[PDB]
Amino acid sequence: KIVNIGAVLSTRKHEQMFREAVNQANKRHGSWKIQLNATSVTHKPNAIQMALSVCEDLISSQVYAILVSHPPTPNDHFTPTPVSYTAGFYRIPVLGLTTRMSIYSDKSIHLSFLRTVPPYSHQSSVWFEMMRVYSWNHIILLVSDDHEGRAAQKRLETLLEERESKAEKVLQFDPGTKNVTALLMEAKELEARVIILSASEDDAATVYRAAAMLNMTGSGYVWLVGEREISGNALRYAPDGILGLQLINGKNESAHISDAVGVVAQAVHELLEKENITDPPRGCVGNTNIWKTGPLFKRVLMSSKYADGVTGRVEFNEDGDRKFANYSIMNLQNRKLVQVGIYNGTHVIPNDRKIIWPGGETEKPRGYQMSTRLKIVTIHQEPFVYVKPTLSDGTCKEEFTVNGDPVKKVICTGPNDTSPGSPRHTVPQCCYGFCIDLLIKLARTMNFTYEVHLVADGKFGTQERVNNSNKKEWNGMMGELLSGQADMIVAPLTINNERAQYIEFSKPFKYQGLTILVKKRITGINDPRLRNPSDKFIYATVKQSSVDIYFRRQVELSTMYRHMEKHNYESAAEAIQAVRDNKLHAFIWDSAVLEFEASQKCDLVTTGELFFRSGFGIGMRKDSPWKQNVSLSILKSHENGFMEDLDKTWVRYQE
């Protein structure tokens, strides 16, 4: 049978190579069982006439496919659109010998379209593999607004969220822009120092100029770009040591033609033995129909593999991506590029010389340039953090103890000293006690400097979703860590699942539970006087706290929680006084806070014992590089007996 295929090129010389390839592939099977022809057209400066010419090419024969290539024109985006749309009307399968834009993969918009070269989006897999190899976890992603940048970012975020790690910071600048120092300035003020670039050549050059002006291209940094950003005028001026990557043998335009014709022949041979010989559309006018077996031909073509291609084994992705093309790692060794390793998209094999980095050093850089000035946020809790006013001399009055050594103190700022009515006022105070001493030991153990301060609301911190919105932002101290106000939390913070979702803790240093305080029938949470509302006994807690979540996390206790929704304190030891004034019947709260005051002052008793047990722990931002050392210090403190000596000092000196 006479089987006909088509093609479109621009060489007028490699078209001879196309006809030679189709004849040589006809030498593989030529018993007339199927017989192959070949047609061709050239490109034109006008697009509408180009579409009409592809129309007339299509009518010329009973064509089974189309092969389109990139002409000497510099507008590489729209060049294969007039052939794809027109033929896309009749579901005629097409192939792309060389095109990299990531819009042709949207199968809902270009109905029938394939490829033999991976798009610009697939580089994210190579970047992820390199990150896994070199172990750089804190990354910064700088991208553009054009569809290609969004697609690349979406793929990289898909991988990172598949490992549930996320990105340190994502920031994008609109395309065709200049004098954009603001965004690099915004990205400069973080601990993560590896930045990943993807933009056009001119934008790459502009970013290079700005970054070189901002000193951010020297030592301590590593930033690796794609392939579109080390070509042309962008390659002219760039900092030394920029990692990159190039295709296996792309832009040959004649190596892929043999593979295209081979796979087309392999597909058409398998297609022709099917019952439905619809026979491709004939005519560009009047025929307002589709090809009756176009989808079937595309499906068989997709799942047809090749044995020995000049560019390697050929398979197709779910949309026609090249599926395991090679990749070559690059570098900038003093104004001249070089090959450093070959990665096949699954793994990277360094098969070349050593790689130099921007600072000229030879040892591998690590990200997260660790700061030394850390903010700290805490709350007013009696047994742990005492707040006091300072004197006029500038130092809070000294206070010796029976041991023979003084009590450590520090200066804590932040509040108005009057929560209910305060227009605007921040005052300096003094803080001391248990957690402050623990912070003293921690800081002296791991070489750092602290600047303590207090929260702006007074509540511990609890997730909530305000009305007229779909996003929920944490409130109070817990929010302060996420939004960037603080860096660490040295305070009695309990460890619940909801907190553990977005922050990460150290090992616990004090275990406890929840219990009840009563002024000297009251018992645990089983009595009908408690399960049901009655005026004889009234229970309450502190609003916007953990116990609120614990009592809203249980359907079968709804009514009881509702009771708590009626009235509760946004308070402190003030609640202990409200119990003292016979206003409140009983109190339910953490074990240590109640047990200290009960045995400390007078006339108050703890009811029964604990029922729900939990610990106390330091809070730190997600995957911060300090947690391991903090936990190793806490365990060492537990093993020494220092938390024992510290414990008697502050809690066992009572009764």
Partner: protein, 501 residues
């Protein structure tokens, strides 16, 4: 000066004769110079040649394109043309009025239609109205389905209700060769509510195979977006009776009304700029030059073509080429196989014509009855502002139809019941897998026949007005001869409470 391009229809004489003189649409605040264009059987060559000739001949300041339904790859050609000529377009029609998310950077399309996000939000609004909280998803391998598969989950996350979903299934259904695996996959999935995604050329296969595996009875209910049912005029056979879809406003409008609306919006934008006394910008030259390298100060025109309203209808067009925040209605198939309106979505509040879904026509979805008994079942008032009652509480609209001989309708206020018997009912619904709807009774307390006719709960059960009945109901030999009871779950008797001690 504007152009009209009829693409396909039946007898074309009506509109062609109607396009004679600019006395039609003689209410647009500008001088109108219309020109008509006819088009035979459609194909890229015909469209390209026709509109290029019109542009080169007439100095056309805008085009409107009306097309036949069921065409799939027409709008993209229009987008490419408009990008290459930079003259605006507007397709007020059925076929090409399906949104494309990514467009070419320099075009100006102005499609009139909604996306999957807005339709899904309306579908979930109507889904949440009737307590429906479990459903299955079935999607064909039609492309652009991952967008839908993820929009469903995003919108379900957005809402507050639990939204506990059973399963999601991806079928591959087409010509009747590969039609066996989908049968097994459809065989073993069960749910009260289905949300499906397929084209009109594929619903005829999906529903045909569904009617073979027991999934069309009145127990189940279906919801599909507006991509299917393309021929709203004459619905086909094998479709289920009473499936819910959402359609933008003006689904009943006439073709003449549609072209009137298109010319009206274009002229309104033009005259809106004219009030600024700047200009009436001329279009690009022609197709043979490939002109228009950059965007001149003409870019205001396109922008000024967005906010302009008309006749009290918001026509705010998004930067994505589709109109944002319109009014859209819900339709369903009654027992006449012709669509009918159900409820509008004006300003973001759902209206509904039916307070209770009709379920018209083995089975499921049995009705229940109960009345206040103080610990067992408690009837109260709904939320102060919401109306969707507290979690773990069942809506129960009492029937107060005390008179229907000369009474129109009694307003069934949405109360919500909670308690012990309702908890047992919830457990039974979870275990034995049925569906229910409570409604209080208003003829006697429990039942004591007044000389041969029963009343209350037992009366409702005996006269087959309700399948079940739960509450505070005692077992005797007087009524156990008439209805059928369950093994008792509460021990009771007779007791005598005295005053004090």
């Amino acid at each position: 000066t504007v152009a009209v391009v009829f693409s396909s229809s039946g007898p074309p004489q009506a509109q062609f004769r109607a396009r004679l003189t600019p006395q039609s649409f003689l209410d647009l605040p500008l001088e109108i110079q219309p020109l008509t264009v006819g088009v035979n059987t459609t194909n890229p060559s015909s469209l390209l040649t026709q509109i290029c000739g019109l542009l080169g001949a007439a100095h056309v300041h805008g085009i409107v394109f009306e097309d036949n339904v069921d065409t799939e790859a027409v709008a993209q050609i229009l987008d490419f043309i408009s990008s290459q000529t930079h003259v605006p377009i507007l397709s007020i029609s059925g076929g090409s009025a399906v949104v494309l998310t990514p467009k070419e950077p320099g075009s100006a399309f102005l499609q009139l239609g909604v996306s999957l996000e807005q339709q899904l939000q309306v579908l979930f609004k109507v889904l949440e109205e009737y307590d429906w909280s479990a459903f299955a998803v079935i999607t064909s391998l039609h492309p652009g389905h991952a967008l839908f598969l993820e929009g469903v989950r995003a919108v379900a996350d957005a809402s507050h209700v639990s939204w506990r979903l059973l399963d999601v299934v991806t079928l591959e259904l087409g010509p009747g060769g590969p039609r066996a695996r989908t049968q097994r996959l459809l065989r073993q999935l069960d749910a009260p509510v289905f949300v499906a995604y397929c084209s009109r050329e594929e619903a005829e296969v999906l529903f045909a195979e569904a009617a073979q595996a027991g999934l069309v009875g009145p127990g189940h209910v279906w919801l599909v977006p507006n991509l299917a049912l393309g021929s709203t005029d004459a619905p086909p056979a094998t479709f289920p009776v009473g499936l819910i879809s959402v359609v933008t406003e003006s689904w009943r409008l006439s073709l003449r009304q549609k072209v009137r609306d298109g010319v009206a919006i274009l002229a309104l934008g033009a005259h809106s700029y004219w009030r600024q006394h700047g200009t009436l910008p001329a279009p690009a030259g022609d197709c043979r030059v490939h002109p228009g390298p950059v965007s001149p100060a003409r870019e205001a025109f396109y922008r000024h073509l967005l906010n302009v309203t008309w006749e009290g209808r918001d026509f705010s067009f998004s930067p994505g080429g589709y109109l944002v925040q319109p009014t859209m209605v819900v339709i369903a198939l009654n027992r006449h196989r012709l669509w009918e309106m159900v409820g509008r979505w004006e300003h973001g509040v759902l209206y509904m014509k039916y307070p209770v879904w009709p379920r018209y026509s083995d089975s499921r979805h049995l009705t229940v009855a109960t009345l206040e008994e103080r610990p067992f079942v408690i009837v109260e008032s709904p939320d102060p502002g919401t109306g969707g009652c507290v979690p773990n509480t069942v809506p129960c609209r009492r029937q107060s139809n005390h008179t229907f001989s000369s009474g129109d309708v009694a307003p069934y206020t949405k109360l919500c019941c909670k308690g012990f018997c309702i908890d047992i009912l919830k457990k039974l619904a979870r275990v034995v897998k049925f569906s229910y709807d409570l409604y209080l009774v208003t003829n006697g307390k429990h039942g004591k026949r007044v000389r041969g006719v029963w009343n209350g709960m037992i009366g409702e059960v005996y006269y087959k007005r309700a399948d079940m009945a739960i509450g505070s109901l005692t077992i005797n030999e007087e009524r156990s001869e008439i209805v059928d009871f369950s093994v008792p779950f509460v021990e009771t008797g007779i007791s005598v409470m005295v005053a004090r001690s």
